[PDB]
């Protein structure tokens, strides 16, 4: 609650995907004028799947369908009824990996969570999925993600967070279709703000 | 045809202002370099915050719609447009001098013209909020590239966002190498969508003919 600066990294990191902008600023930097490299896609008509249907997920998903985005999800807590007043059409988590062109993950961290996609999600997922975790790492298994990214089942990957804080296996952050920050979910002065407030009226 | 480009370019500058706001390009880059910063990189949360968009055609209009969902405020020009239809789509238009004190974020939609070239100069700039961010999706030349460097070196910008250029690559890295600067070589309507939209709507004006 203390939410929407992660929703908003979150809804930017999507928007990184789909143009590619900071390899496309890194390439500038070095003297480069690449147009038909950073070809990208457009976000209108496109599949985004919202795993984790909570205060961070219902602001990324009414966020991204301003821009014409169909957005799907689970939540094994949240009802049909509740995702559809926030239009989250909730479908079991095997028929949404074939449908989405995008994904993203907003679950608390949780064993039930720890590897929520691996080879065996991936594989089941459309081929140049695009994959975003600024939630909370190993949800997505950064072995599975690595191969798939690999082998082109996976077109590029958005990771705000990692196992391990600084992580030490550069080989996610070193590749070309790989988006990163240094955990700056929260990393607002507003939220950060909110967070020391809001500690204060639940103490009392 | 413009018509084809319009979603495209929209969602590019969307990109841009929550590029300049989270300083994704600069954190990926800090990250690639093997280096992990985080009272460095400090953002800004969009809601709340004033968006002013010069420019309410096609492009302007989309903007507008997509950062509205952000709940950021969005005030806007264009002397073509009235301020019943800007309304219409949520855009409060006021007179152009009346919108650089109220932007946090400021954003060009507006054909290239000698009226429009250089409208964001250093007249316009000493008007505009201390930290004030910049996005030019649209013509190079909009916002006087000289008085932006002045601006980003005073630090009366904070940061800019430009798709865009005078010369196409710019001969001049002075802007491109500023450490508050976010640049694309000019992908705007560099999408597949937008370019089939485009390669069909002109093919079957060539065939109209006949
Ligand atoms: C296997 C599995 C288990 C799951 C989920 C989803 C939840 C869950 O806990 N949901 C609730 C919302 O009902 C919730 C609570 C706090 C956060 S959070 O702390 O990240 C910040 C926030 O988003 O508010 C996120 C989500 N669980 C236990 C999914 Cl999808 C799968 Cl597949
Ligand atoms: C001094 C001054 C003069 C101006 C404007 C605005 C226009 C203008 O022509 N407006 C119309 C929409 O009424 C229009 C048409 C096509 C495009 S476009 O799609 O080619 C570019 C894009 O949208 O990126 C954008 C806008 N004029 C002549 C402004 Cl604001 C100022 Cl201050």
């Given at each position: 609650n203390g939410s929407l600066s992660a929703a908003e990294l979150t809804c930017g990191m999507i928007m990184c995907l789909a143009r590619q902008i900071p390899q496309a600023t890194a390439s500038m930097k070095d003297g480069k004028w690449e147009r038909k490299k950073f070809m990208g896609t457009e976000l209108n008509g496109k599949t985004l799947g919202i795993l984790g249907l909570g205060r961070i997920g219902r602001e990324v998903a009414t966020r991204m369908q301003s821009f014409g985005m169909k957005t799907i999800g689970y939540d094994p807590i949240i009802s049909p009824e509740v995702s559809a007043s926030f239009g989250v059409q909730q479908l079991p988590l095997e028929e949404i990996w074939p449908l989405c062109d995008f994904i993203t993950v907003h679950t608390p961290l949780l064993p039930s969570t720890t590897?929520?996609?691996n080879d065996n999600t991936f594989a089941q997922c459309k081929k140049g999925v695009r994959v975003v975790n600024?939630?909370?790492?190993?949800?997505?298994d950064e072995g599975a993600l690595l191969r798939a990214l690999q082998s082109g089942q996976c077109a590029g990957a958005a990771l705000?967070?990692?196992?391990?804080?600084?992580?030490?296996?550069r080989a996610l952050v070193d590749h070309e279709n790989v988006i990163s920050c240094?955990?700056?979910?929260?990393?607002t002065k507003e939220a950060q703000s909110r967070c020391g407030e809001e500690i204060a009226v639940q103490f009392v």
């Open positions: 590897g929520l996609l600024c939630a909370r790492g190993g949800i997505v705000d967070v990692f196992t391990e804080e600084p992580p030490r296996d240094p955990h700056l979910g929260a990393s």
